[PDB]
Design a protein around this ligand. Sequence first.
Ligand SMILES: CC(=O)Nc1cc(Nc2cc(NC3CC3)n3ncc(C#N)c3n2)ccc1N(C)CCN
Length: 331
Amino acid sequence: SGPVPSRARVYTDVNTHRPREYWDYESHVVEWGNQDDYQLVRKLGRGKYSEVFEAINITNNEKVVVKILKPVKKKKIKREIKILENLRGGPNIITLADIVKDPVSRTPALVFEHVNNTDFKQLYQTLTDYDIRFYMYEILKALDYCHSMGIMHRDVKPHNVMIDHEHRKLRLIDWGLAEFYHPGQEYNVRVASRYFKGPELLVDYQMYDYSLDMWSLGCMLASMIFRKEPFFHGHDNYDQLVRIAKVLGTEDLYDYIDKYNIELDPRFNDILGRHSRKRWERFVHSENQHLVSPEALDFLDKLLRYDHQSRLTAREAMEHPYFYTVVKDQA
Ligand SMILES: CC(=O)Nc1cc(Nc2cc(NC3CC3)n3ncc(C#N)c3n2)ccc1N(C)CCN
């Protein structure tokens, strides 16, 4: 028989209660700005789906970020656009400022608010215990918001988190992989970066939900408090699950497989083996102990569960003791 169905335990029917237009991005008509309002200054980066530049809007002299898209299905551009427009003004969500097209090449480009970011491979090593709790709380505000709005980010990782440390400003960016949550929908499991893929993606369980972002957030938190990047360092997608199983144990993995009646890929049978669930203490040492506390460990444990239904929601995560001093300081 097939796999047992699953539903998000929070914000389950939020898109159903909305007009069709809210989530039916295939019928979205794109509103285009003037390409001549922007002059590219320099290249900032790239990805599999785009080339990123810094630009100046010459009508108001403001610095912006321009994401020039490589060839991609128009419905995927409509999806990114619709999600960015729906989430606009939301806490710590990047602002989509404009959408332009080159009149000759017909290449579309998305224009974003600029964040004066410090590269994580330089910033993270300077973060104190308080900074990690502070920035994790800022990411949770963005996740609880997009989840409440019926959207899963599906690509939560350090590279998609822009931090202006001087101004303690955080933005969750690159909504190119984000989707609308619909109960009963089967999603593509070939999403997210290897090191941040949830167990549901690695076992090919397609009926996933917002809880996928919570696994990714747990991977991020583990790399920051343990100063071990990446935390789960797989050689490929199969070995990625082996790396998780060597920490969380194989018993809870097979209990998860059995609960949802998942047909496990035969490749896994000879590589998963048998592993006990490890204690978080084995990753604690003299160079990271200042970042690790019993409440950081309790919080991390509640994020990194094989069973997606048993992970903390973003709202539950915000109520965790790990954030008591951040919450107090914000009041
Ligand atoms: C623009 C986007 O979605 N992706 C993206 C963004 C960047 N870089 C930056 C850099 C900065 N600020 C730094 C001081 C220069 N900002 N400020 C806001 C935004 C946004 N949005 C942004 N994006 C690099 C690569 C990618 N992609 C293709 C691969 C990773 N997913």
